[PDB]
Design a protein around this ligand. Structure first.
Ligand SMILES: CCCCCCCCO[C@@H]1O[C@H](CO)[C@@H](O)[C@H](O)[C@H]1O
Ligand SMILES: [Zn+2]
Length: 256
């Protein structure tokens, strides 16, 4: 088995699918987690980016991407899976064609810009598929509607469809604790029946320990009960006990 996980940001795959990644590695699968929006960023930073850097426990003008890449490597090494850091800039570092920052909340902009980004991400994913030759791709459902998650999900769907590789979407955590869960896929795609995994306690522990490697995100993610909320979420999906993660297969719609 060759499992390619496609994470929007540096932490999403571990937060949402860390137990599944860890189990896959345990079972002897070759597992690679490619993070789309891991692109190097340098000052000048927007005021919004400077504020986020502060929330992440960094100086406003620090190399936040460098810090997060190192966190990601530690977390993924802890799960014993490989990493690959993509070239795309996180939403807080992107500019619009007219020179404005993308984020301020997202500034009004042309769908053309969204399409162009999705196209480039899709190009990179098609190349990674050629290079890694995955038997399964898993990426985010984009529950919560973060534009980077939506771009990642849509690009992965288009790339996998063209390359004829099976794809599944994970339930975005911790977002799904606060959202309804319904998502709007690009035309022609739909979700099949959910799978709710049940993993051994060791895999829960491995996942939670890996999450902790993302120290910069802990204040943001905890709001001080992140792990309790993750446990409660799994409990609600599997009342008989045991930790797990929800994923859906993505298939072609009828008449498409
Ligand atoms: C960014 C668009 C507005 C909606 C707010 C959603 C909550 C923010 O979410 C975050 O945003 C960042 C910047 O993209 C990231 O670097 C993070 O990993 C992430 O958790
Ligand atoms: Zn994210």
């Amino acid at each position: 088995t060759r499992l390619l996980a496609i994470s929007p940001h540096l932490d999403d795959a571990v937060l949402s699918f860390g137990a599944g990644l860890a189990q896959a590695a345990q079972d002897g699968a070759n597992v690679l987690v490619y993070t789309v929006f891991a692109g190097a960023a340098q000052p000048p930073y927007s005021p919004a980016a400077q504020r986020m850097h502060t929330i992440w426990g960094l100086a406003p003008d620090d190399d936040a991407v460098l810090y997060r890449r190192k966190e990601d490597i530690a977390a993924l090494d802890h799960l014993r899976v490989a990493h690959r850091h993509g070239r795309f800039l996180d939403s807080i570092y992107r500019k619009l064609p007219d020179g404005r920052w993308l984020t301020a909340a997202v500034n009004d902009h042309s769908p053309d810009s969204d399409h162009d980004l999705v196209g480039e991400v899709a190009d990179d994913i098609r190349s990674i598929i050629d290079e890694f030759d995955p038997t399964l791709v898993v990426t985010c459902a984009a529950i919560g509607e973060h534009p980077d998650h939506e771009a990642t999900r849509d690009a992965a769907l288009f790339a996998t469809h063209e390359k004829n590789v099976p794809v599944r979407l994970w339930e975005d955590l911790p977002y799904a604790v606060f959202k309804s869960g319904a998502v709007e896929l690009p035309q022609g795609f739909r979700l099949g029946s959910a799978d709710v995994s049940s993993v051994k306690p060791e895999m829960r522990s491995q996942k939670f320990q890996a999450v902790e490697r993302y120290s910069s995100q802990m204040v943001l993610l905890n709001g001080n009960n992140l792990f309790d909320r993750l446990d409660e979420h799994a409990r609600q999906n599997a009342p008989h006990g045991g930790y797990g993660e929800t994923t859906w297969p993505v298939v072609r719609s009828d008449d498409s």
